[PDB]
Design a protein around this ligand. Structure first.
Ligand SMILES: *[C@@H](C)[C@H]1/C(=C/c2[nH]c(/C=C3N=C(/C=C4\NC(=O)C(CC)=C4C)C(C)=C\3CCC(=O)O)c(CCC(=O)O)c2C)NC(=O)[C@@H]1C
Lengths: 172, 162, 162, 172, 162, 172, 162, 172, 162, 172, 162, 172
């Protein structure tokens, strides 16, 4: 597991080189944006249950075949597993947001997951839809202008959107 | 790699938890301390060469036999002296990596893991590298909390050698 | 009990390590954040009674059947209403414990562990306590990072109920 | 494991009571002394190997029977175990210093240790001497007036001295 | 899936045994009881619709707020009422599966596993489904050991909800 | 684990003797009472959640100190453990009812339990009160004359009462 | 000891379950079969002596060398013949224990566990006891399901010897 | 693991449908044939050792190369393993007979077995011969008209023959 | 396969060690003893046929019923007698393998593993093979330490049969 | 694991045949050469650390890219692993020397090792160079004419050379 | 303690075996080699003092800085020189223990276990003790297999230091 | 685990002293008696099954209450355990004979065994009788003058008798 800082270190060491002025300045900016990052993480985590539930309800409304008899999310066991996966993915996405690097998400969550779903008969394209919805709500919650010092978090929202699309791409 | 952030994540993941305010505080501590850490890392990086050359002589002065005694483990040939300065640079470079990463991760993975077996197999005395680190610590020219950051990772190295 | 400090210790002890700068930074984050945390805990403590009484009515207004429907699980008798205000006070008190301890430890041990079995066995709806927590969150009267601290532990409670 | 803050919480909850103004002020002071505490911990940890070695050398100089043939610290295995115990005790003492509470030391280190030593034939009174020496050096290192903002850490040094004496009392 | 037969097999296989008279007796008990079990399953199946419609109203009468209060968890819209009758039918159908299989297997796998997380995540009160099951139990119109079979699996459902 | 039949066998084998006519007749009667026994077990198990909850509510009403701050059943964790113990005891009591012998209850539930409670600080006398209440409700449910072939189950109810009193005696 | 009842309990306890209708059916099978089991056990018990004496001769006729060949393992001395009839009685007694208990429990614990090591250590041929069991099976004089019960436990013995 | 009854349930639930009159009648007949099924199982199990031994002796008589030096059943270890496999297969076949469904046999015995034999060098075609012989003896024992209420078990014998052929097909 | 050498290797490998003088001594013991071991193995090999034929009759004389009694387990048909001499040859051959390998390895793998199940399944009495081994031991015609080697592996066989 | 003696036995048993005079004489010669074999093993083992170190130093002198930043033997962890592999290979080679058969080396060391190196990114051709150097030094040490009864060990040195080349072939 | 005998026992006990000829051979190797081992142990014991004094100077000649450089780790004070000769005697004594015990056991337990941590903690260079051992090996004055025994345990020491 | 040689070493090291001439001569004699020791071990091990069986038969003949219904050796399970203990004790006695020291017997066999028997209800005095009989037969087998180079093994037989009496003393 790497964060944004260790990633530079690991790249510098492979070269056997000290950090450059460009790298030092690149990492100082990350620090200077740290407050916004923590807000995003605090905001998405404080509404994790709503993001999951509301995304689940929307998915089943658009794809009612997943919950009809014979569907992959039919029976409470499968429904619970499905909601669980959604929590798991959102959990490791917030891990990536805090670290500033996707490695934790790739290694501990998206690695081999596409194969897991194919062996079980779970439609990965439907999982991606579930992920895209958590994303929209997560960004909407994270970038809410209310009750927070005004400022520009657009670069941060683009990064967060990337981790979600990465998970969606990995399962489809 | 061990940093305050990966430690915060690792703590939450070990128990299948979402991050909590308990871990966010820890990361905020990292961000606040980064100002002094970067200052130390920049200064050591800018003055690395003179520190490396000064530290190498500190060793040769403390242990004159390292420049006369015969053997591949010693700095008694041009090759040996090049290996020695190289090693000193490795140590110093690792310190700047710890400062930037906010933790001992870089030194743990790249230098400390396996250190005792390398020093035993190649007849390298830990006492030589402790002297070099003691020199860097005394002559890096840092004050305030920048010095506290630098010395904390340098003393971490000395402990791994002791 | 889980706090930033016990988490720092637990991280070092799990691997038979002395504390490092990696963990000291995390604790410094706790000390820096404590200023806002204490402010929030004091205010909620000072205004706890009105918040408890206001939150109880918020519930009774949202779920009128809790004051008319017959059963020991409801607040339709003087005893039931006393149990309900008591429970609300427990939740609020736990929040001030989390603020003071700097982590979710207090709520984890005293309230969250076993919550689902208590609410199932005694026919208590999680929806009642979410409403109460939503009331406290909207009417505690805190601003700035004091509100961020309070809400973070209140939203932690709502998540455990959802 | 409790720290100084959780300890108050656990005492308040046993009463079912909110914190008092006295308690709030008592915990604010701990925070206001946090910098000094971290220094003490950083200082003792950064010289852990010297404290151990120098205390070990002194103990064996005063009690040479521990290292003569037949002694409890004779043979490299026993000598290594002895030095190990010294590192372990110093490690959990620094844990207590950071937490502001001895619980971690009592529960994870001093609990049942006196019985361990009696079953093995290790003289606990000699362990206490080893502990008292680490203490003197640890305080001397922690309270060094050089290279640090001037101020009064006396209350903190008294606390640290307490954790050491507690370990010494527990083994003897 | 747990039935008297799979339980008999599982008992012998766990210890690498051939079946014994110990297990054959258990299966004979299943075959003897099947006469009453089938009778119950047929009757509930034949009258399922009226039982489903009667049970849904029992709930709406016990908890009038479920048909007025606003929210997706309630039966205050045509969609909600369709979800509710659907769920009741699921419960009743599972009961007939247990009767036919001679055990709780069907309900364990299809309904009970994960029940608490579904009811928490979707804001569904166990009290609603207990009322529906209580209605089915009182109005299925069975006597003798057919009623004993039906009620045993219905009370099994109520216990999982309590 | 023995049932009523294996118990006789184990006593006969210790004598090395075949069963006597008295023993054969004694075991035939058990069989002839089997229907009533199964009813009792089915009835108590089908209302296990009510027996537990209603007994718990009554205990805390009579002994409110168990749930006040500082009480042994205060906090949801301890309350959940307490309810759990009540379910566990009722579970192994129904095991004894079906087997016609208390061995399963003694060996798997009451063995060493009194010591467990003393080490934790749980008042065993209060546990016994909880047990005595489950008993009264269990017998009341098991011996309900409604919806069942009329007959005399008094001997069976006395036996069931014995298993409960045995558990109560074991914890106090 | 393994019986249908202890197997039912063991199945529920292994998973921390209350008994279910799944297990009650199994026990009802035991109670229903007990009528034939008791009948078989009584008859074998009443005629045990003649069966023991008849079976001992069946062996001596099949294996004449057991009454002439010299050695403590054989029935060529008054003591050996007493050991042999004793053993046959043990087998028959165990069968009546299985019938009464409704399972193989008694034979498993008292006779089958360790059987191979006793027969190896003491030079006892399994073929001798199979012949005795074959005699008892053919001459016990039972019909219907009483014979099915008896033979099932006798064939269980022969399998353990084969 | 499914039996004949759970199999219908699992098929009905995939449709989300109650059982039909045809299904109810189909399962009542299984029950009405239960006595014959138990006899078959009791009969084959009570002679398991003879079926195995006699089938083993016949196989080695027809294929003496399996037991000559270099053969796959040469040495007591391999011979014991071979006899073991025969007992195992017969054991799981009787499991299927009692359940009225082959799932236990497929999942716990025949799954991946063909690959096991190919990796070891065991001739699967010879295993099938061993299986076909156990079958003939098992049916001959199960359908013996002596000492049993007269009746027609032909449908049951056809089913039993199916489980054996299934195992033979799976290994060859 | 267990020999003094593989045992020496296995001892060092189990602990990730290079071989030491501790293990070399053990192998030297094997090399020194090999002189007597080979002598025994050669003699038994050269006289194997007469020993096999003599031992088979020893059995038939001790247990006359093995040549008259009817059954596939007995030597009462030309096939049975061929199986019996074959088995005796197997035992003797295994003994020469143990002598050559310097250990029980060959007998452990090829003969002892599974012996009890083969003798039970096929109705073979261990007493028959003990008699054959006793004959070979008394009539192999070896003296000195060659006899000690032979008998040690023959008595190892008898113990596995007892 | 086989040695030179068990190997013949296992080949003879596959034929079901006693040993021949040729085989007996072939194994007597092994014994008569046992002293020389033990010397070789004692000599190589007594200088294991020198063979490893000196071969490692030579490899890195000829292939300095392995230890430059980015190299497979860069960092102390990888360097320690590399030296470890060299000790491991030399250890199992000496095992083969003592047993007179390569089976222990093949089964416990060279089996699947080539795939291990390919997955990690370790150049197997460089490992072979490391092995070829340990060989030259090992033979040079084993065949040193000093301080030993004079005689011809050439056949033994050829065998030892074979085990090394086998390991080199297996990794490349 | 590891000797050829305890290794033979440990091998049999690990598998619940009686000793076999496989292990007796290994012990015979120990008894045969003991003649040379004792000879070596006696000679080193008789000449231990001169070997200790000669080896100490070998070190001081190889590493002159050990008698001038200041520090408690060095032999630059009368106490340091006494510690050094003491250590050399320990090594030599351990070698005679290995010879007598027939294995590395004594050195493994008393000296090798923990060696790296003692040499690191106390700033002792393994190179000093290797030189001393090299001196003892070259000047013990043994020939034949007595020298082979001595050197095997001395080279075992050098390997543990390398 | 110590043998006769390591025992001296461990005693010498506790003194920090080299071996004395008396000790060297004391250990040379052990070696010079090694052949006789190996014979004893080979002889007792080669007849282990007879010693056990014959001692078991004699014990039950003298103490028939152990095998009558209710006896501690009644049922095949208990009888097998009893014979097992006898094999175990004889096994660890032969271990002591080979090592020349009882430590293996004390540590791995007799330690805590007396308490094991008291908790189970096994009469230790009867176990001692079983041990005394194995002894008599073991010595009789080990000291048989037939088929062995003539000589005096009396000192060795006294030692062997000691290990048996030690086991008998430990269980009674
Ligand atoms: C007392 C037990 C009886 C007795 C023993 C005895 N043996 C010898 C000589 C030898 N004993 C052996 C046996 C072995 N050496 C080994 O390495 C092994 C393990 C494979 C064994 C089993 C050997 C080889 C000899 C030497 C050759 C020979 O046969 O003599 C003696 C004589 C003294 C001596 O040590 O040589 C004795 C006394 N003899 C008796 O009368 C006692 C009944």
């Amino acid at each position: 597991m790497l964060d944004a800082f260790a990633k530079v270190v690991a790249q510098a060491d492979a070269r056997g080189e000290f950090l450059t002025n460009a790298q030092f300045d690149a990492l100082s900016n990350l620090v200077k944006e740290g407050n916004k990052r923590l807000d995003a993480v605090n905001r998405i985590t404080s509404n994790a249950s709503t993001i999951v539930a509301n995304a689940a309800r929307a998915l089943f409304a658009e794809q009612p075949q997943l919950i009809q008899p014979g569907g992959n999310a039919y029976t409470n066991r499968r429904m619970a597993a499905c909601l669980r996966d959604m929590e798991i993915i959102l959990r490791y996405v917030t891990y990536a947001i805090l670290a500033g690097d996707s490695s934790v998400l790739d290694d501990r969550c998206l690695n081999g997951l596409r194969e897991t779903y194919q062996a079980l008969g779970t439609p990965g394209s439907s999982v991606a839809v579930a992920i895209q919805k958590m994303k929209d709500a997560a960004i909407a919650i994270a970038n809410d202008p209310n009750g927070i010092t005004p400022g520009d978090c657009s670069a941060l929202m683009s990064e967060i959107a990337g981790y979600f699309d990465r998970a969606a791409a990995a399962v489809a | 790699m061990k940093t305050p952030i990966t430690e915060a994540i690792a703590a939450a993941d070990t128990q299948g938890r979402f991050l909590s305010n308990t871990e966010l505080q820890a990361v905020d501590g990292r961000f606040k301390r980064a100002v002094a850490s970067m200052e130390a890392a920049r200064a050591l990086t800018n003055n690395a060469q003179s520190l490396i050359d000064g530290a190498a002589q500190a060793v040769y002065q403390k242990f004159p036999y390292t420049t006369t005694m015969q053997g591949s483990q010693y700095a008694s040939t041009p090759e040996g002296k090049a290996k020695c300065a190289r090693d000193i640079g490795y140590y110093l470079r690792m310190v700047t990596y710890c400062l930037v990463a906010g933790g001992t991760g870089p030194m743990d993975e790249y230098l400390i893991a396996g250190l005792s077996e390398i020093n035993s197999t190649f007849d390298l005395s830990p006492s030589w590298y402790i002297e070099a680190l003691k020199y860097i610590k005394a002559n890096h020219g840092l004050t305030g909390q920048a010095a506290v950051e630098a010395n904390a990772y340098i003393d971490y190295a000395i402990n791994a050698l002791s």
